[model samples]
Target: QTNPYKLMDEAAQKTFDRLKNEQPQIRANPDYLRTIVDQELLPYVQVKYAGALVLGQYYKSATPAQREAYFAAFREYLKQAYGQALAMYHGQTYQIAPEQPLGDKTIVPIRVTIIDPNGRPPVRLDFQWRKNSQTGNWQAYDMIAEGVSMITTKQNEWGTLLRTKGIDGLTAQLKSISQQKITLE
Candidate 1:
């Protein structure tokens, strides 16, 4: 039987395939991950919403140029973070939990468990998918890892910085983060 989350799973599998196939190229050029994210994953993500969440209170006041700059930085930052995690994949298996029925909301909640091969504890990941009313496809807007909401955490952290130091400061900080080399333990 075809999985209900076939689109989501296929997107992730394609990313993993690229991570495996282009390991050396990515290792040599850290920014290459940004390209992968743009080409392979960005379409499946609600990046605009994620960018707005990161901007929080500052989004309303941001000029078009400022908003564009922030989205660029936010995309790069996500590339660094996700690329590091994908690079660490070692034949891990993803098991999807039983699906629960959605009452009326357009959002779908998916539960997944990552089984480690090296005897490490399994990791649980919860994904929130929103269906585009214009299109039937589901796009993921946020993920929860081990009960922590990634969007909420980033919003709190970045919102505080934007409140204290303003947009330029937040943009600078995101740029710095995106330029750094990220690695997994």
Candidate 2:
């Protein structure tokens, strides 16, 4: 049967294919991941700055220059995280459902069911999107993977670190996460 979320699945498929076959590192070809991200991923991700605020250390305390630096630096870190996640796909299959309603918000939700080889429960994704005028496309903003919001979870982790160690702590954490190379399974 043809899946309802074919468009999104197609985009996810493209991303997965690129990560498995083409991407070796963030530097592999910034465009290798950039095209898919700018095209397929960004539209769906919720406002990343919110994530930055929740995840960035010293965001509130930083001066304008520092805030800008935090934003730019965190953006790079988030992109690399996504690239690494993409690298983890290994022919895992998924299906998308029709968009879900969320009142006046311009958010579209697509579901993806991922099969796990380790006999684990299938991973379910509820992806949220927002429309971008400049690109005239819907971009992903937040995802509920297995009923968990990726942003919320990440924010919690990063927030806790920030609380404990401050902005420098968060930056160091991001740096550590960035250092781990993504490998296709």
Candidate 3:
């Protein structure tokens, strides 16, 4: 809790534990990851702000209602999508890149390097975090894996859809994808 690296380590431990301990139940019931996401993951992330950025140029034009609607839809899609995405991992080791200077900062990044189990090249997956008004704690809003930023990826794809299909079209696609089947393997 005090150290950013501590938080990441704790989260990793807690996450692998749940996936291992409740895996049977998770396999039996597909929505188990949804619970883990809401309880274990989301509390540590600020997708509200992240999603706003993903809206990009469209964000400025979206009315208050439209903004809320898109964010909600974005949450659902990510919830289930990552639910399936989580199925791919099986315990991997990572190390934190120590901070250059230890000082109080509003926005701080905790860099990490994931050592591939296959002996492939290591990858950088940094958690871009910020201090929020409510918690005043460091929580992640965006993640940059390798060279690609998750928010930018979403913005590129979703921005085009929002432009071509409108808000309703984008929501429909999100909901549609959310309802797709989840896999354990």
Index of the highest-TM-score prediction: 3
Residue clash pairs of candidate 3: none
| lDDT winner, 2 or 3 | 3
TM-score of 3: 0.85
Error of 2 at 96 (Å): 0.5
TM-score of each prediction: 0.80, 0.67, 0.85
Indicate the residue-level lDDT of 42 in model 2.
53
Residue-wise C-alpha lDDT for candidate 1, range 65-127, written one tens digit per residue:
988888888877787777666657666767776666656767787878888877788999888
On lDDT, the leading prediction is 3
When 2 and 3 are scored with TM-score, the better candidate is 3
lDDT for model 3, please: 0.76
Task: State residue 29's C-alpha deviation in candidate 1, in Å.
Answer: 5.0
lDDT of each: 0.75, 0.62, 0.76
Per-residue lDDT over 1-185 for candidate 3, one digit per residue giving the tens place of the 0 to 100 score:
65566677777667767876777788788677877777777777887788778777777887888878877888888888778866655555667776455477666777888665876678788888777778776678888988899998877777778789877678788888888767766
Model 2 stretches with alpha carbons more than 4 Å out: 1-7, 19-47, 56-61, 99-105, 116-120, 132-137
The digit string of per-residue lDDT tens for model 2 on 28-127 reads: 5443454556565654554544455465445657667655655555666666677656555555666667554446665567777877666667889877
